[PDB]
């Protein structure tokens, strides 16, 4: 669970946003990289800037076992909290149901010249991303797991109380401009700008990325850090608890009421004490979301 702190940039018309990703070395160890973020409309509407809120970001990184080329199959959940106790931008509509994503990437790393390209679905009111990657210049010079942030926040899961602080949304569909900057300690750096805009049906994301100052025998251009992270529940765990979730899930909202909570476990064959449930829904904690009850249910394995 890594947390995006988000603030608006009231200059720029925009927001920006810093975080910390702690990626595992080999055989022990946990190499740092510090990000810095900027994102800017594309076009000229308004759009919600918000207050200091954060985004927390459940990340799995599997391989797809019938892909011969070098490739990295993505799931992602978010979703928007700090902010306590709304609006919804018109361009909250278009994120209301499952929409596809494209990304495509150029970059140069330290000289070494790539390209990924990835295409996948969003789901908004789950706050659920899936997404298969594949570099279609060869072998990545960088690992998988550098390039997972750089690889949509627009498809965040922002609480009801909160959907007015979202900006990735409301810029569209003209889209933004994300820029950033990324610092691998005791290493080089990454440096760069995507637009994220609609593009017929589709969320597309071209990024261009350059990376200097790798050492050439540290933990990147090196590959020495750990692709999975097995602290994780599993693909046919998770689909279960969207099923079962979603069942229950009465307007489709993306929301559980937190009574509710109880049955949706039971329909599952696991049986919560009442003195379960109540710590569940406090250390995560009327309305739960997805990857919420995804976060409670990861905990208690």
């Not at 550098?146 to 009801?160: A, E, G, H, K």
């Not at 200097?212 to 608890?241: C, M, P, S, V, W």
Request: negative net charge; proline residues 4%.
């Amino acid at each position: 669970l890594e947390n995006v702190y988000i603030m608006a940039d009231k200059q720029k018309n925009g927001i920006k946003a810093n975080f910390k990703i702690r990626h595992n070395i080999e055989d022990g160890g946990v190499q740092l990289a510090y990000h810095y973020q900027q994102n800017t409309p594309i076009g000229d509407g308004p759009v919600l800037l918000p207050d200091n809120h954060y985004l927390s970001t459940q990340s799995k990184l599997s391989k797809d076992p019938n892909e011969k080329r070098d490739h990295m199959v993505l799931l992602e959940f978010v979703t928007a909290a700090g902010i306590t106790l709304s609006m919804v931008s018109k361009g909250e509509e278009l994120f209301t149901g499952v929409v596809p994503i494209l990304v495509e990437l150029d970059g140069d790393v330290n000289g070494h010249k790539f390209s990924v390209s990835g295409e996948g679905e969003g789901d908004a009111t789950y706050g659920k991303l899936t997404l298969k990657f594949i570099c279609t210049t060869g072998k990545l010079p960088v690992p998988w797991p550098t390039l997972v942030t750089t690889l949509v926040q627009c498809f965040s899961r922002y609480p009801d109380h909160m959907k007015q602080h979202d900006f990735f949304k409301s810029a569209m569909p003209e889209g933004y401009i994300q820029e950033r900057t990324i610092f691998f300690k005791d290493d080089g750096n990454y440096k760069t700008r995507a637009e994220v805009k609609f593009e017929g049906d589709t969320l597309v994301n071209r990024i261009e990325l350059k990376g200097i100052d790798f050492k050439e025998d540290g933990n990147i251009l090196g590959h020495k850090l750990e692709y999975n992270t097995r602290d994780q529940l599993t693909e046919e765990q998770i689909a279960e608890f969207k099923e079962a979730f979603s069942l229950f899930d009465k307007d489709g909202d993306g929301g559980i009421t937190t009574k509710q909570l109880g049955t949706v476990m039971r329909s599952l064959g696991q049986n919560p004490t009442e003195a379960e449930l109540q710590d569940m829904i406090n250390e995560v904690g009327g309305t739960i979301d997805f990857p919420q009850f995804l976060t409670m249910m990861a905990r208690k394995m």
